[PDB]
Structures are given as C-alpha cells and as structure tokens.
Design a binder for this molecule. Structure first.
Ligand code: HEM
Ligand SMILES: COc1ccc2nc(SCc3ncc(C)c(OC)c3C)[nH]c2c1
Length: 450
C-alpha cells in the first residue's frame, strides 16, 4: 500500500504543520483524518506516524526495531547528553548506566524510598489543610512541587523545598523553557537564521541554571545515604566493571531530575481532572482510600493495596500519556503489516494517545474514563497500552512513578472532597510532555488527622 501523507508546503514538505503550540494534538487530528499510518516529511528527514495496535504490536518487536532518537529527543540531548533517555541502545553508556542504576529501582530500594515519599506527600496535604475557605488549588503547580521534591529527596537526598515557595522553583522555570524551546525547534526550517540567536542564548542560560543545581547536589553529597546518586558516584557495571565518568553522571542527574518528576506531575494532574469530571469514579476511588489507608500515614504495603487507584492512574495514562510519543528505527529491511515495506534505518513514531484510542481494542466508548478497563491485564491485547515505552528501552522509573502517584492520590482522596468550582475546560499544554493548563479545584478537608 501507498501510505497517506498530510498536506504539504512545497520544499518545506510537512514541517509547517508543527507550527503550533499543540503539535501532538495536531498530529492526533491528522491521524483521525488519515488512519493508522501516515508519512511525515521535512527537509532532509522522514518518519512514519503509527496509531493502531495492529501496527504498533509489530513495531514493538525488538528483533526488528530498536529505539530511535526522534527529532525531539535529539534536541533534548543538548542537555540530557548520553544519559539513559537520550542515548542509543548501541552506545556503551546506555547499557553501562542501565546496569549501574537499575538497583536503585529494586523493590528493596522502593521500600526504602517509601518514607521519604510520605514526607513530601504530607507536605502537600498540610498545604491544602491550611488554605482559607475562599482559596483554591492550582493543580499542575502543586503536583510539580510534590513530584520535584520527591525525586530530589529520594534520588539525591536534596530538599528543593518547593512548598516553601510561592513561585515555581527556578529549576522548573528553566526546565519548562528548555522543553518549550526544544518543542519549538521542531518547526524551524532555518535553525541558524540570526532571528534565533536570542532563543539560543536563552537555551544556554536555562541549561546553565539546570547544571548549576546539579553542581550544588554533587557538592552537597561530597560535603555530607544509599540512593540513586550513591550508585551514580560509586556503582560499577558488572559487565565492564567500570563506573560512570563525571560527564555522564552530570547528564544522568539532569535526566533523572526532569524525567523523574515532570510526567508524574502530569499524570497526577490528569487523574484528578478525570476524577472531578467523573463523580462515580471519584466515589469508588475515595471508598478504597478510606477502607485501605487506616493509619495516619500510609505504609508501603497499603499503597500496594490501592488497586482501584492504580486503575484510575492507568486509565488517565490511557487517555493522556504524559510522554506521548516514542520512536523506533528498522534494524533491517522489513515489511510492516504485510503492506508497508520499510528499509533499514527507516524511522517510526508511535503516537501514544492515538494508539490508546484504537476502537478495535477498547470498544466504542474510547473517550470515556473507565478504570475498570484495567481490572485484568490478561484481557488486554499485547502492546495496546504503552505509556511507559517498550522492551529494554522501557521506562526504568515506572514503579517509582506509579508508587508515588498511588500514595499521593490515595492520601488526597482520604483527606479531602474536591470541587470543580470553575467547570474547568480541559486545555492541554505541550512541552513535549503534556499537562492540563489552568486546572484549579477547591478541596474541603474531611478533618482526618495526619
Ligand atoms: C507517569 C510517569 C512517566 C511516564 C508516562 C514515563 C514515560 C516514559 C517513556 C514513554 C519512556 C520511553 C522513551 C522512549 O522510548 O524514547 C521512558 C523512559 C525513561 N524513563 Fe520514564 N516515565 C515516567 C516516569 C519516570 C520516572 C519517575 C523516572 C525516574 C525515576 C523515569 C525515568 C526514565 C528513564 C531513565 C528512561 C530511559 C530508560 C532507558 O531507556 O534506559 N520515568 N519513560
Ligand atoms: C513531533 O515530535 C514530537 C512532538 C512531541 C513529543 N513529545 C515527546 S515526549 C518524549 C519523551 N519521552 C520520554 C521521556 C522520559 C522524556 O523526557 C521527559 C521525553 C521528552 N516526544 C515528542 C516528539
């Protein structure tokens, strides 16, 4: 078959279609019009957008396709380096860091992180317990305070103290602006035009703010734990026996500070959004939290018991996966779906929110929020649900994210009743990652002691 392709702009091919603040949402509307696969061309490059489980299940065969750096990831690599997110599977520092840092996500490590996650969660709850009755909550802003602080503490034994700040933390502000710039660069035909000189200076300034904080964290540890930073500094790869060098360490710290909170803030924000928009689901979730979290602070085992909360989080990741794309390349010539021949090196993009709206998998109710879809993972076809990527390049933090989000959402639902007081209209801000923008609620304390 000849694959469909959205509208073109002469020598610019499809590139001007990314001239939007909301490119993933634009691509989804394209996929709506064109179907399970379309070509996307730009000067000097081509990729193919996949949206069906039918095709994506083939793309997830690691014998045929390896992780690719998308254009977006290539631009992020300017500050993520060859850390785990942005390294090719075949670069020595991928498997070496993977082997050295994977012990930081063992169940043993997770049990040990639990107390420090509670420390941040309690801070969130006390903030909300302390608001006057006229006040409201800025949801993605507070979920970023929580999630940044959690990775800072658990990962690095470092306190960002975001709840002691009325503006976002400076690290956040620079992070957002760096991700924004990377996103905006996707549409630039002439990236070296002098009209982009200020963007470039701004980008280098934001990358410096981030690296200055890495330096503080590294200096704090040298002056001072068994955590992610301990493994980075002292850990030895069993295969090669070497430790990470200093350059890679720095890339890994910035990688983990960003990738280990931004998307979890998004998830928590979407989940609360869907709960306030779906009162019967909120009741059921709140019923579980009340039944399970019987102690003044949750235990590790209790968070593991919050099954339905877990399902709410998975359903929120189904509709709005917060890292909404990943990319693959063909390891050899191969044919996709019996219909689309690919050559070695051809690029694919998995459009995750559109995969997760495949009516052949989920049914016709795909836009509805129904956590019960997730009651039994065996009843879901292979590769239908991919918010955490695929295979040996899958998200290393998945359990850390989901434990944190399940603990915090559980406490939220135990401690407060929530009101969508403004009848908020979903507005999804894109910074490569996805988050509701301007989402606000009021929270009425149930007055249960902490
Ligand atoms: C809901 C939250 C999260 C989502 C939706 C998310 C999603 C993803 C996805 C889609 C990938 C694959 C990227 C690709 O194939 O190019 C990825 C990889 C990665 N994630 Fe996550 N993630 C989350 C949370 C976390 C957290 C909390 C951490 C750290 C504690 C983390 C660390 C990483 C790392 C290091 C990789 C690269 C792994 C490798 O290739 O070796 N993520 N994640
Ligand atoms: C058109 O090209 C695009 C557009 C938006 C996109 N958003 C993404 S999200 C890709 C991604 N995945 C995983 C992690 C861990 C990560 O760092 C937090 C990022 C940026 N990729 C895109 C590619």
């Amino acid at each position: 078959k000849e694959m469909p392709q959205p509208k073109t702009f002469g020598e610019l091919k499809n590139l001007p279609l990314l001239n939007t603040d909301k490119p993933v949402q634009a691509l989804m509307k394209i996929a709506d019009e064109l179907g399970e696969i379309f070509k996307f061309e730009a000067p000097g490059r081509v990729t193919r957008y996949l949206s069906s489980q039918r095709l994506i299940k083939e793309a997830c065969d690691e014998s045929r396709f390896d992780k690719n750096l998308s254009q977006a990831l290539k631009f992020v690599r300017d500050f993520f380096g060859d850390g785990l997110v942005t390294s090719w599977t075949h670069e020595k520092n991928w498997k070496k860091a993977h082997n050295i840092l994977l012990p930081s996500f063992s169940q043993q490590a997770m049990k040990g992180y639990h107390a420090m996650m509670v420390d941040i969660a309690v801070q969130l709850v006390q903030k909300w317990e302390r608001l006057n009755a006229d006040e409201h909550i800025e949801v993605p802003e507070d979920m970023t305070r929580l999630t940044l602080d959690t990775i800072g503490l658990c990962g690095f034994n470092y306190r960002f103290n975001s709840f002691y700040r009325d503006q976002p933390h400076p690290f956040i502000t620079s992070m957002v602006r760096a991700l924004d710039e990377a996103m905006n660069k996707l549409q630039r035909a002439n990236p070296d035009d002098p009209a982009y000189d200020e963007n470039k200076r701004q980008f280098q300034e934001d990358i410096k703010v981030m690296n200055d904080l890495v330096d503080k964290i590294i200096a704090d540890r040298k002056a001072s734990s068994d955590d992610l930073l301990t493994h980075m500094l002292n850990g030895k790869d069993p295969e090669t026996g070497e430790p990470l060098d200093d350059e890679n360490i720095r890339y890994q710290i910035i990688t983990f500070l960003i990738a280990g909170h931004e998307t979890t803030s998004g998830l928590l924000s979407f989940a609360l959004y869907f709960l306030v928009k779906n009162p019967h689901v909120l009741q059921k979730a709140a019923e579980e939290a009340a039944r399970v979290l019987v102690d003044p602070v949750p235990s590790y085992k209790q968070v593991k018991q919050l099954k339905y909360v877990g399902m709410v989080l998975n359903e929120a990741l189904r509709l709005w996966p917060t890292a909404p794309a990943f990319s693959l390349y063909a390891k050899e010539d191969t044919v996709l779906g019996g219909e689309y021949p690919l050559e070695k090196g051809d690029e694919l993009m998995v459009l995750i929110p559109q995969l997760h709206r495949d009516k052949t998998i989920w049914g016709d109710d795909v836009e509805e929020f129904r956590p019960e879809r997730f009651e039994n993972p065996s009843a879901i076809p292979q590769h239908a649900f991919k918010p955490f990527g695929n295979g040996q390049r899958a998200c290393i933090g998945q359990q850390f994210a989901l434990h944190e989000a399940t603990l915090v959402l559980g406490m939220m639902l135990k401690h407060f009743d929530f009101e969508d007081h403004t009848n908020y209209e979903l507005d999804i801000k894109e910074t490569l990652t996805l988050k509701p923008e301007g989402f606000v609620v009021k929270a009425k304390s149930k007055k249960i002691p902490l």
